[PDB]
Ligand binder design. Structure first.
Ligand SMILES: [Cl-]
Ligand SMILES: [Cl-]
Ligand SMILES: [Cl-]
Ligand SMILES: [Cl-]
Ligand SMILES: [Cl-]
Lengths: 234, 235
């Protein structure tokens, strides 16, 4: 609670900003996060606190779970970093909002989409339906409407990590830890029975899937696909 | 991002000296000074205090002397839940307490002369006291009431009884033992060293010399007024 701004490599950061931080577990895949607090310590160094958002490969989940192209999940981790950890800006958008249009902004980096909060303790994904309560209180934006947008969802990036002797009644596995001051080195996958009803299109094995979701190999043959965001309009 | 914190109907502000619950000893609180306060997304209120050790919590020569209520400054800037605050206190700078008294009224009176190196176990006399404070009050001037002819009783180490039975003047500096990591050491250690002839700060009981403003154990003067709580004597 000292500073309203910090500058790193000729770039400003403020509380509320979406930014990337150095990951000690993978120097090429940065931690995606949002700054909640800035300050200076007695020694002159500048510090910040960001709520960590995990990439799919960093979570523990069923092997059949599908993700959006650039999906991230919010955690209960709020961590302190030397501002010299910042490696650039990005932008995380709430899926419900992104369903209806694009952010009216000039993104200064990669765009990530979030639909779920991740319960690190019980390994449980929960749809966030009140984005506002997730943000720092001192920031609680326009949107460019798009006609009928759909989302390609893709299989787990760590689906190849299912144990050879897995069963649908296995205990939920633990993530693998690397550096203590970093996101999990790698999550883990496990097996469960199919389901009939699937309101949010979470799993590839479910009988039902929402109409705005295109599951792998469904392969439509009409519309315009945005390779980068894996979105499609028609 | 907070201005003040109210615990048990007591207001705490940055730059304040206070007592924090010590998980190694519920009746011997951590002495600290509040460097900053803030609220986390969940609403809990936090603070960052610079820890100050008591003698029993440090590693030092078995013949080291200490003032009554002496504390040392450390490099430990720790975060606490403000619920940890158990009371106010005040830490005064030896050189100041040497000339007189603080001109104010909210708890136990400690004095600090030395800062403590946790890596090499070195005590270094503090000459620039303002540099140890939070930036916000670093240049704030305080009132001191002059007291002529004040001397200090020094006291033998409270953990002298922990000297190994086979100690020598050339044994390596020992390590403290840690209890809770969310707390200062459960207890420090003592070791032996050859004594010195010149000792300006009156640090050791075996030194030939001792400055005039210090009175070592057994060296009792048969005149003057003694304040029991602080071990100060005048006239
Ligand atoms: Cl899952
Ligand atoms: Cl760091
Ligand atoms: Cl595609
Ligand atoms: Cl010593
Ligand atoms: Cl705590």
């Amino acid at each position: 609670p000292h500073m309203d701004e910090v500058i790193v490599n000729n770039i400003s950061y403020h509380v509320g900003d979406w930014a990337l931080l150095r990951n000690q577990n993978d120097p090429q895949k940065p931690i995606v996060g949002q700054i909640f607090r800035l300050w200076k310590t007695p020694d002159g160094k500048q510090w910040l606190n960001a709520c960590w958002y995990y990439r799919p490969e960093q979570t523990v989940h069923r092997v059949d779970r599908l993700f959006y192209k650039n999906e991230v999940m919010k955690t209960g981790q709020y961590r302190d970093h030397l501002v010299s950890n910042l490696v650039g800006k990005c932008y995380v958008i709430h899926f419900t909002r992104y369903q209806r249009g694009n952010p009216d902004m000039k993104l200064e980096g990669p765009l990530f989409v979030c639909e779920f909060r991740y319960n690190e303790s019980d390994k449980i994904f929960n749809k966030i339906r009140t984005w506002k309560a997730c943000l720092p209180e001192e920031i609680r934006e326009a949107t460019i409407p798009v006609n009928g947008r759909k989302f390609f969802k893709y299989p787990s990036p760590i689906r190849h990590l299912l144990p050879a002797n897995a069963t649908p009644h296995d205990r939920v596995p633990e993530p693998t830890m690397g550096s203590p001051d970093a996101p999990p080195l790698v999550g883990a996958v496990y097996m469960r029975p199919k389901m009939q009803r699937d309101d949010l299109g979470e799993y590839a094995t479910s009988d039902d899937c929402p109409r705005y979701i295109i599951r792998p190999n469904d392969s439509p043959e009409e519309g315009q696909v945005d390779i980068e965001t894996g979105t499609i309009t028609t």
